[PDB]
Enzyme design. Sequence first.
Site, PDB file in Angstrom:
ATOM      1  N   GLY A  29       0.877  -1.148   0.000  1.00 48.15           N
ATOM      2  CA  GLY A  29       0.000   0.000   0.000  1.00 48.15           C
ATOM      3  C   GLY A  29       0.920   1.204   0.000  1.00 48.15           C
ATOM      4  O   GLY A  29       2.094   1.042   0.293  1.00 48.15           O
ATOM      5  N   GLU A  50      -0.068   1.853  -5.144  1.00 49.92           N
ATOM      6  CA  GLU A  50      -1.336   2.392  -4.630  1.00 49.92           C
ATOM      7  C   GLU A  50      -1.938   2.808  -5.937  1.00 49.92           C
ATOM      8  O   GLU A  50      -1.212   3.307  -6.780  1.00 49.92           O
ATOM      9  CB  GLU A  50      -1.140   3.624  -3.757  1.00 49.92           C
ATOM     10  N   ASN A  92       1.251  -1.373   4.662  1.00 47.28           N
ATOM     11  CA  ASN A  92       0.519  -0.791   5.796  1.00 47.28           C
ATOM     12  C   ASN A  92      -0.846  -0.555   5.253  1.00 47.28           C
ATOM     13  O   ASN A  92      -1.327   0.572   5.144  1.00 47.28           O
ATOM     14  CB  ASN A  92       1.159   0.537   6.250  1.00 47.28           C
ATOM     15  N   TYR A  95      -7.010  -2.473   7.202  1.00 45.24           N
ATOM     16  CA  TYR A  95      -8.195  -1.712   6.794  1.00 45.24           C
ATOM     17  C   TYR A  95      -7.865  -1.521   5.313  1.00 45.24           C
ATOM     18  O   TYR A  95      -7.085  -0.630   4.971  1.00 45.24           O
ATOM     19  CB  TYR A  95      -8.250  -0.306   7.444  1.00 45.24           C
ATOM     20  N   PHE A 154      -2.260   5.265  14.380  1.00 48.22           N
ATOM     21  CA  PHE A 154      -2.902   5.577  13.107  1.00 48.22           C
ATOM     22  C   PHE A 154      -3.836   6.804  13.242  1.00 48.22           C
ATOM     23  O   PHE A 154      -3.563   7.902  12.738  1.00 48.22           O
ATOM     24  CB  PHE A 154      -3.744   4.374  12.666  1.00 48.22           C
TER      25      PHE A 154
END
EC number: 2.1.1.184
Length: 235
Positions: A29, A50, A92, A95, A154
């Site tokens: 990511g 990404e 990372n 989610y 985060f």
Amino acid sequence: QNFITSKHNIDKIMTNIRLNEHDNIFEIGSGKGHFTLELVQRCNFVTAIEIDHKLCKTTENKLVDHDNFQVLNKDILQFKFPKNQSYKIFGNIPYNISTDIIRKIVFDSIADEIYLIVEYGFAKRLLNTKRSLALFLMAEVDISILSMVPREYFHPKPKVNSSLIRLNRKKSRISHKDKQKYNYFVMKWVNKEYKKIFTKNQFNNSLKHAGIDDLNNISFEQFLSLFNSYKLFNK
């Protein structure tokens, strides 16, 4: 939530990780430049990924007086990882992290090691037998909790936490040769359909040989024993 930026954490978790300046890695990511930066100086090269164009620009800059570039913006699932040179992988993407990305990453690249922060709950999802996904990954990669990601390193989203995981391969078995066979087995086994695997003459010593009691809680190792017995049964 594409946060977690703050060089002090991004140094404290990189702590237990085994990357170095001999490694070429893939940033699964991108995030918000945060990590693609800490690695560019930590590893030899880096190639982030990404899709949306914005993000790449973001990164693009957060990386100056730094030419270990490559910040492609395509669909990872569709990405063609190299099948020649050796390399690692970092992501990372907690989610946003699915199982389809975990597959690309593990069964469709020769990435030697895969580090990635994932919701702690997503960890068992990969860490429990009687769950094919695990039984499948465990046949090549070695899953282990390396760290945690407490507080709001985060932003919000708790209910749960994240946690750093390492997926390191072994030459190991489950020979491509007999790999359609291992999938059935894995398939039928988790599906409780033991009637398709071995016969009851077999479902027994097999279990007894693997030394299996809590049959509802296998140890892969035992699942291993099983597959092997299975593999050598013929009725």
